Coordinates of C-alpha atoms and ligand atoms in Angstrom, one line a residue:
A8 CA 44.6 -33.8 -50.2
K9 CA 43.6 -35.3 -46.9
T10 CA 40.3 -36.8 -45.8
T11 CA 38.5 -35.7 -42.7
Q12 CA 39.9 -38.8 -40.9
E13 CA 43.5 -38.0 -42.0
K14 CA 43.1 -34.4 -40.8
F15 CA 41.8 -35.7 -37.5
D16 CA 44.8 -38.2 -37.2
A17 CA 47.1 -35.2 -37.8
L18 CA 45.5 -32.9 -35.3
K19 CA 45.4 -35.6 -32.7
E20 CA 49.1 -36.4 -33.2
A21 CA 49.6 -32.7 -32.7
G22 CA 47.6 -33.0 -29.4
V23 CA 44.8 -30.6 -30.6
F24 CA 42.0 -33.2 -30.7
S25 CA 41.7 -36.4 -28.8
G26 CA 39.3 -39.4 -29.2
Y27 CA 36.9 -41.2 -27.0
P28 CA 37.7 -43.6 -24.1
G29 CA 37.8 -47.3 -24.9
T30 CA 37.9 -46.8 -28.7
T31 CA 40.2 -45.5 -31.4
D32 CA 37.1 -44.5 -33.4
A33 CA 37.2 -40.7 -34.0
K34 CA 33.4 -40.5 -34.0
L35 CA 33.3 -37.7 -36.6
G36 CA 29.5 -37.6 -36.6
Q37 CA 29.3 -36.8 -33.0
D38 CA 29.0 -33.4 -31.3
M39 CA 31.4 -31.5 -28.9
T40 CA 30.9 -29.7 -25.7
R41 CA 31.9 -26.1 -25.4
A42 CA 34.3 -27.2 -22.7
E43 CA 36.1 -29.7 -25.0
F44 CA 36.1 -27.0 -27.8
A45 CA 37.7 -24.5 -25.5
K46 CA 40.6 -27.0 -25.1
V47 CA 40.8 -27.5 -28.8
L48 CA 41.1 -23.7 -29.2
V49 CA 43.9 -23.6 -26.6
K50 CA 45.9 -26.3 -28.3
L51 CA 45.2 -25.0 -31.7
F52 CA 46.4 -21.5 -31.0
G53 CA 49.1 -22.4 -28.4
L54 CA 47.3 -20.5 -25.6
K55 CA 48.5 -20.5 -22.1
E56 CA 46.4 -22.5 -19.6
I57 CA 45.1 -20.4 -16.7
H58 CA 44.9 -22.3 -13.3
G59 CA 43.3 -21.0 -10.2
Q60 CA 41.0 -18.5 -11.8
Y61 CA 37.2 -18.9 -12.2
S62 CA 35.3 -16.2 -14.2
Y63 CA 32.0 -18.0 -14.6
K64 CA 29.1 -18.9 -12.3
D65 CA 27.9 -22.1 -14.0
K66 CA 27.1 -24.9 -11.7
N67 CA 30.2 -27.0 -11.1
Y68 CA 32.5 -24.4 -12.6
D69 CA 35.4 -24.4 -10.1
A70 CA 38.8 -26.0 -9.3
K71 CA 37.3 -29.5 -9.7
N72 CA 36.3 -28.8 -13.3
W73 CA 39.0 -30.1 -15.6
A74 CA 38.0 -27.5 -18.3
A75 CA 38.4 -24.3 -16.3
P76 CA 42.0 -23.7 -17.3
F77 CA 41.1 -23.9 -21.0
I78 CA 37.9 -21.9 -20.7
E79 CA 39.8 -19.2 -18.8
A80 CA 42.5 -19.1 -21.5
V81 CA 40.0 -18.6 -24.4
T82 CA 38.1 -16.0 -22.3
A83 CA 41.3 -14.0 -21.6
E84 CA 42.1 -14.3 -25.3
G85 CA 38.8 -12.8 -26.3
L86 CA 37.7 -15.9 -28.3
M87 CA 34.7 -16.8 -26.0
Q88 CA 32.7 -14.8 -23.6
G89 CA 29.9 -17.2 -22.7
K90 CA 26.1 -16.9 -23.2
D91 CA 25.1 -14.4 -20.5
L92 CA 27.3 -11.5 -19.3
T93 CA 25.1 -10.3 -16.5
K94 CA 24.9 -13.8 -14.9
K95 CA 28.3 -15.0 -16.1
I96 CA 27.2 -18.3 -17.7
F97 CA 29.6 -19.9 -20.1
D98 CA 27.5 -23.1 -20.6
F99 CA 30.4 -25.6 -20.6
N100 CA 28.4 -28.8 -21.1
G101 CA 26.3 -27.4 -24.0
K102 CA 27.5 -28.3 -27.4
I103 CA 29.5 -26.0 -29.6
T104 CA 27.4 -24.8 -32.6
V105 CA 28.7 -24.0 -36.1
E106 CA 28.1 -20.3 -35.6
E107 CA 29.7 -20.3 -32.1
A108 CA 32.8 -22.1 -33.5
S109 CA 32.7 -19.6 -36.4
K110 CA 33.0 -16.7 -34.0
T111 CA 35.9 -18.2 -32.1
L112 CA 38.0 -19.0 -35.2
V113 CA 37.2 -15.8 -37.1
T114 CA 38.4 -13.9 -34.0
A115 CA 41.5 -16.0 -33.5
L116 CA 42.4 -15.5 -37.2
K117 CA 41.7 -11.7 -37.0
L118 CA 39.2 -11.9 -39.8
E119 CA 36.6 -9.2 -39.8
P120 CA 33.0 -10.2 -39.2
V121 CA 30.9 -9.3 -42.1
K122 CA 28.6 -6.5 -41.1
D123 CA 25.4 -6.7 -43.4
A124 CA 25.8 -10.4 -43.8
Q125 CA 22.6 -12.2 -45.1
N126 CA 22.3 -15.8 -43.9
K127 CA 20.5 -18.3 -41.5
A128 CA 22.6 -17.5 -38.5
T129 CA 21.3 -16.2 -35.2
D130 CA 21.5 -12.3 -35.2
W131 CA 24.6 -12.0 -33.1
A132 CA 26.4 -14.4 -35.3
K133 CA 25.5 -13.5 -38.8
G134 CA 28.7 -11.6 -39.5
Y135 CA 30.9 -14.3 -37.8
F136 CA 29.3 -17.1 -39.8
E137 CA 29.5 -15.2 -43.1
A138 CA 33.2 -14.5 -42.5
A139 CA 33.8 -18.2 -41.6
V140 CA 32.0 -19.3 -44.7
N141 CA 33.9 -16.8 -46.9
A142 CA 37.2 -18.0 -45.5
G143 CA 36.3 -21.7 -46.1
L144 CA 36.1 -22.7 -42.5
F145 CA 32.6 -24.1 -42.9
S146 CA 30.6 -24.8 -46.1
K147 CA 27.9 -22.3 -47.0
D148 CA 25.3 -25.0 -46.6
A149 CA 26.3 -25.8 -43.1
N150 CA 23.6 -25.0 -40.6
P151 CA 24.9 -22.1 -38.4
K152 CA 22.5 -23.0 -35.6
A153 CA 23.2 -26.8 -35.5
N154 CA 25.6 -28.4 -33.1
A155 CA 28.9 -28.7 -35.0
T156 CA 29.9 -32.2 -35.8
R157 CA 33.5 -33.3 -35.0
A158 CA 34.0 -33.6 -38.7
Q159 CA 33.1 -30.0 -39.3
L160 CA 35.3 -29.0 -36.3
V161 CA 38.2 -31.0 -37.7
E162 CA 37.8 -29.3 -41.1
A163 CA 37.5 -25.9 -39.6
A164 CA 40.4 -26.3 -37.2
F165 CA 42.6 -27.8 -39.9
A166 CA 41.9 -24.9 -42.3
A167 CA 42.5 -22.3 -39.4
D168 CA 45.8 -24.0 -38.6
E169 CA 46.9 -23.7 -42.2
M170 CA 46.0 -20.0 -42.3
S171 CA 48.3 -19.3 -39.2
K172 CA 50.8 -21.6 -40.9
Ligands
LIG201 C1 23.8 -16.7 -26.7 O1 24.8 -15.6 -26.7 C2 25.9 -15.9 -27.5 O2 26.6 -17.0 -26.9 C3 27.7 -17.4 -27.7 C4 28.3 -18.5 -26.9 O3 29.4 -18.9 -27.8 C5 30.4 -17.8 -28.0 C6 31.4 -18.3 -29.0 C7 31.1 -17.4 -26.7 O4 31.5 -16.3 -26.7 O5 31.2 -18.3 -25.7 O6 29.8 -16.7 -28.5 C8 28.7 -16.2 -27.7 C9 28.1 -15.1 -28.4 O7 28.9 -13.9 -28.3 C10 26.8 -14.7 -27.6 N1 27.0 -14.2 -26.2 C11 26.6 -13.1 -25.7 C12 26.9 -12.8 -24.3 O8 26.1 -12.2 -26.4

């Protein structure tokens, strides 16, 4: 039975998570941008990086943005679609929330969102969050609307990896 730190060490060794510049501290209580999380998903699920394609209109989303290949992969894969379809905003600097992460992993794992789910999640996410809870990706007392901590993301990613095996 591994601690959150040991799960992190393992995922980092596997190249799925990385740390912070200048320090080996894993900063498990810190948050994560949607950009960095896209990359996590790409490494976690072995997705192919997509260069030279730009499907969003966010400021500074272009060839100079290191995250675009990962964001494009998770979008082609159907894991993430962004926050606004008519304006094509992904919001890559905003932080990944528990309910957002829940959707991505539930989808990757082909678990079915719970229609009729009763919980504190935003409307669009209720079923994804319930499915993620039921599958043990996040604790039931996690706050679906909060920014996910890196600890929570390490636990969720580690559990998801084990379910793909
Ligand atoms: C605010 O709208 C939500 O935005 C969420 C952003 O996070 C993810 C995981 C994403 O697809 O990128 O999920 C999004 C939700 O589907 C939802 N987006 C829309 C367009 O309805």
